Amino acid sequence: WTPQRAANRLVKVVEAVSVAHGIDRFPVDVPQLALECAHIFKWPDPITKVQAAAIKGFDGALFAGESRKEWLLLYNDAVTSPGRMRFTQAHELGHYILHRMQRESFQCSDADMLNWSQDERDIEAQADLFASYLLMPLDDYRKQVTTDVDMDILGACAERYGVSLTAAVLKWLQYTDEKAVLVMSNDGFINWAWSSEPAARAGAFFRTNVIPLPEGSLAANPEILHDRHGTKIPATVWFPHADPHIPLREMKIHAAQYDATLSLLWLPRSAEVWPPRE
């Protein structure tokens, strides 16, 4: 099984069960799927318990029982949010479907839940991709982002799918044809960055080292608490090799669910920011 094929099957289950009950599909009820997952995939070793706990040091876990005949899905419910809990549950369900023959257990941190990538050998990234496909099926998500993008629109996605704002933005970056970069920072320093595919192709990405924010950015000003629609500034503030007249829109919002600052940078479709070829 792959993240996309496994999620596709479970999205069909969600659709069918929601219709049968006469209820909304979203947000997805992950515990219900987890308890049915062995039946849905025709396996003998089910998840038999999905349990909230106050967990220190990680956010979710999947533990094989004695003789690997049943599995326990534990998720943190302390100092978190419903959207983080739902994503953690889906992430652990991803390990159950995709990875459980590799290990006796999985214990997964908030960082694991933010590490979305397309590297198929990174099991944390693969569980994140699974969770993104299950919780935010693209057919439906695309209908939520049409004529404009801003933190209000992406916040509405987060509410609709029952995920964090960060997860809703990452989903958009996963598929958009726009050139955009999300930067998560704390106390003036960049901790994570993620680029849309067009941005990455154009050189607009940051490898993460703890690196200060640009001194002229909206992000770096503690006084600016939020800018949900995005102020137009020179692209060179963030991407020094951009041509000097290229603008960028910089959005800013406090990520309550992660207690950090999110900066969403939106570049023109034509922008290229690679350095000169020496």
Ligand SMILES: [Zn+2]
């Ligand atoms: Zn994990």
